Amino acid sequence: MGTIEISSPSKTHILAFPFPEKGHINPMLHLCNRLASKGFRVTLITTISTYKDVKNLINLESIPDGTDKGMNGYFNQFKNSVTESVAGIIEEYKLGHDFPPPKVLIYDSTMPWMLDVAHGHGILGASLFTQPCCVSVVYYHMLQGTIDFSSSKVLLLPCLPPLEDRDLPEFDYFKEDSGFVSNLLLNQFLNIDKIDYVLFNTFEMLESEIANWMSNKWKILTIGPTAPTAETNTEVCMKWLDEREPNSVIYVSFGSIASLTEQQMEEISQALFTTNFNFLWVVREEERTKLPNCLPSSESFTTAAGKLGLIINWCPQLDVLRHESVACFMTHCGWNSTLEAISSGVPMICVPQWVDQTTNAKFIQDVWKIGVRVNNGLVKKEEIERCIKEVCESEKGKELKRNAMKWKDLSKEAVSEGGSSDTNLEYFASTLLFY
């Protein structure tokens, strides 16, 4: 005689709150699906403006965007507003009757003060880093002042390859804002010893040495890629790709924020309109006016080489990357783009722009050996064409593609049963249930 209590995922309530930007929303969202696939109740909290895009099982809550229409004023208003409204949501659910009360807030690692919201409301806090281990450690070392950041400089950090100046995360691009952006990334570590779960969207084999190094300081859980293994304009892009030859398309995307200069846009244009390959070039709506005048939701071309090109304002990038028609990825090397390509086996042309893109480029070409970085800071048509020849028209290109298929298989192994990422995510979920 007596009573039994069962803690299952279905009675455990996970809150998620990403920073409102696609390279932060996207990997959170994938992780919420995986967690829901594991039976938990998952509520994704998101700003009202991102709510729409996102809105197109997983619970969805909206909060006020909390930001009048510079980087700094926007951020302090944001910090202030979302601190209040997320704290309010947590309390809403603690009294609710439908859902279970929340056990843990997963928050983007660029909002470390959300650990205080979570703890200060008596729930666990899980920090999701949306960048690899190797660049995150650089931010930590800059935070610590572990080293000094007519001569060139090379930095030697434990468990990392030598880093040239150009290999460091690029903050100076932001000029008077470099201090804010740099602060934002280093402050990911202000309370690292206090975070209940430290999650990294990466997989162990990709960053063995530095991941183990961070594991001996912090019980970090590498859990990526969060995206599934084998979006606006899906049907359009797949139709066009379905009708191209295999291994014939150069996929070109510079992410969701970066915006190249008129001159740089022209360098790329001339390289792609004269190359021996088809091309699918994402050019965001707001960026379209920076195109060469010689060229609206999409545009179809016959290139001067007699090939075919499609300019479009947004695509399902993951599905493009996994289409047999894609030869290579010309990318700005944001970490989501880099990891999606890794998990798809697509070799890469690296045109890094700022923050962690420069360091990702370093690793893509020199550590993982799955792509080439362009040399500058304007990048000339001729330099783009050299890199296309390297990656798509050369025996080197062929080894690069082999390298990428090896990393893709390792990536699929990591998130499959008994994979290192599958283990870590199961460690997250199982301990969530513990008394």
Ligand X SMILES: O=c1ccn([C@@H]2O[C@H](COP(=O)(O)OP(=O)(O)O)[C@@H](O)[C@H]2O)c(=O)[nH]1
Ligand Y SMILES: C[C@]12CC[C@H](O[C@H]3O[C@H](CO)[C@@H](O)[C@H](O)[C@H]3O)C[C@H]1CC[C@@H]1[C@@H]2CC[C@]2(C)[C@@H](C3=CC(=O)OC3)CC[C@]12O
Query: Residues forming the annotated binding site for UDP-alpha-D-glucose?
Result: 24, 26, 130, 256, 314-315, 317, 335-337, 340, 356-357
Q: Which two tokens stand for residue 133?
A: 């281990």
Name the minimum Å distance from CB 70 to ligand Y: 5
Count of positions on this chain that bind ligand X (CB under 6 A): 20
97/239 with CB nearer ligand X: 239
- Residue the block writes with tokens 């190359």: 275
Exactly one of 9, 12, 14, 22 binds ligand X (CB under 6 A); that residue is 22
Paired with 61 in beta bridges are 45
Alpha helices (H) in 111-231, listed in sequence order: 114-120, 133-144, 178-186, 208-217
Footprint on residues 251-280 left by ligand Y (CB under 6 A)? 257
Which residue reads 């290139």 in tokens? Answer: 303
222 touches 423 (CB < 8 A): no
> What is the rounded CA–CA span in Å between residue 170 and residue 101?
41
Q: Please, which residue, 206 or 355, has the CB nearer to ligand Y?
A: 355
Structure tokens at 190: 């202000």
In this structure, are residues 222 and 133 in contact, taking their beta carbons and an 8 Å threshold?
yes
Task: Give the footprint of ligand X on residues 327-386 (CB under 6 A).
Answer: 334-337, 340
CA distance 327 to 435: 51
Residue 240 in tokens: 């066009």
Binding residue for ligand Y, selected from 13, 24, 244, 369, defined by CB under 6 A: 24
> How many other CB atoms are found less than 10 A from the CB of residue 365?
18
In the list ligand Y, ligand X, none, the entry touching 282 (Cβ below 5 to 8 angstroms by class) is ligand X
Closest distance of CB 314 from ligand X, Å? 4
Cα 346 → chain centroid: 16
Task: Indicate which single residue of 138, 265, 282, 327 sits in contact with ligand X (rule: CB under 6 A).
Answer: 282
130 binds ligand Y (CB under 6 A): yes
For residue 70, the partner it binds in ligand X, ligand Y, none, with Cβ less than 5 to 8 A by kind, is ligand Y
Q: CB-wise, 26 or 424, nearer to ligand Y? A: 26
How near is the Cβ of 132 to ligand Y at its closest, in Å? Answer: 9
- The rounded distance, in Å, linking the Cα atoms of 136 and 142 is 10
Residue type for position 122: G
Q: Of 74, 149, 218, 301, which one interacts with ligand Y (CB under 6 A)?
A: 74
**Toward ligand Y, which CB reaches closer, 162 or 179?**
179
Burial of 258 (0-12, 13-18, 19+ CB in 10 A): middle
Q: Is 184 in the site for ligand Y (CB under 6 A)?
A: yes
Strands 348-350 and 326-331: parallel
- Told to check if 108 binds ligand X by CB under 6 A, we report no
Contacts of 116 (CB under 8 A, 6+ apart): none
Q: What binding mask, one character per residue, do residues 350-369 give for ligand Y by CB under 6 A, x or -?
A: -----xxx------------
287 binds ligand Y (CB under 6 A): no
Q: List contacts with ligand Y (CB under 6 A).
A: 21, 23-24, 70-71, 74, 130-131, 181, 184, 257, 334-336, 355-357
Please give the residue ranges that form the binding site for ligand X (CB under 6 A).
Answer: 21-23, 26, 231, 253, 255-258, 282, 314-315, 317-318, 334-337, 340
